[PDB]
Design a protein around this nucleic acid. Sequence first.
DNA 1: TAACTCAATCGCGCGCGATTGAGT
DNA 2: TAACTCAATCGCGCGCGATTGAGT
Lengths: 134, 143
Amino acid sequence: QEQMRLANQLCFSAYNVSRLFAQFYEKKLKQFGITYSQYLVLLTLWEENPQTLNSIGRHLDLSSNTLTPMLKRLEQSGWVKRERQQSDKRQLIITLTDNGQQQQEAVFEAISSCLETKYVFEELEQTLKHLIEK
Amino acid sequence: MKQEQMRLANQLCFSAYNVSRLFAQFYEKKLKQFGITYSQYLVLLTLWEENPQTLNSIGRHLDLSSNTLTPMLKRLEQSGWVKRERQQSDKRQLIITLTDNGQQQQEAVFEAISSCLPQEFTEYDETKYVFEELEQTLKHLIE
DNA sequence: TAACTCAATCGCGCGCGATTGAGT
DNA sequence: TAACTCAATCGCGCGCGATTGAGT
C-alpha cells in the first residue's frame, strides 16, 4: 500500500514539474515564436547540424508522429530546412537556417537572464524505461 | 559560469520531460484494462481522497482548470466513473461525485499498478523530496 | 516479386492562453 | 446598470498507438 502512495506522489510531482518547466520556458520563448518542444529540437540541432529526423527523434525519444508536423512548423517560421537525402530518398535531412543558427545566443540569453537532482532524474528515467519493457 | 549553468537547467528540464512521459506511458499501460487515461487517473485520485468536489476544487489540487477538466470530466461521466451535477445554492458551480462503480474500482486499479512496481521501493524517499523542492522552486520562478 | 525501413498520416486526449456567456 | 465568479468553449500544439505508402 505504501509503495503505491510513493509512486503516485512521485508520478504526480514529475507531472507538475514538467508542466512548470514548459510554462516557464514558453514564457521566455514567446518573443521568438517557438514552443518548448521546438526548443528541445533546436537544442539538439545547435549541438549537431544537420541531422535526420530519425536522429533527432532518437535524441529526444520521439518519432515522426510528433516530429513531422513540428519540423514543418519550424521550417514555416524560418528556423530549419527540410530536404530529402539523395543516397536514400526515404530519409529527411533537417538543417538549420542561418537565422536558426544565429539566434541561439539570443535565445539562451533570454532564458538565462531569468534563472544531485540531475542524477536522481536519470536514475528514475532508466528505472521507468525498463518497466515499460520487462 | 555564464553558460554552464544553462547546460544544467536544460538537461534537468529535458530529464523532467522524459520522466513524466515515461510515468504516463507506464500508468497508461496498466490502466488500459479500465479504459482510463493518466490524467483521468489523477482526477480519480483526488476524488478517492475527497468526494464530492467542485471542478474548481479538483483543478486547484492538480493545477488545472475547466479548459482541461470540462471535456475530461465529461469523458469520466460517459464511462460511468462520476456524476456531473450543478449545485442549487450556486448554479454556476459543478459538483463532481464518484459513482458506486467509481469508488468500488479503486482497490482493483491500485492493485493493477502496484503488482507491477519493482521491489526497489524504502530508498526512494530522497527522490520524492528532491522533486517537491524543484516543484516549489519552479512555481516561484513563474511569478 | 519480397522484406525492410523510413516519413507521413490518422485519431484522440490532453494542457493551456484566451474568450464567452451564464449566473450571483 | 455594474463588478464578480464560475464552467464551458475555442484554437493550437503536442505525444503517441496505430496505419499508410513511398522508396530500398
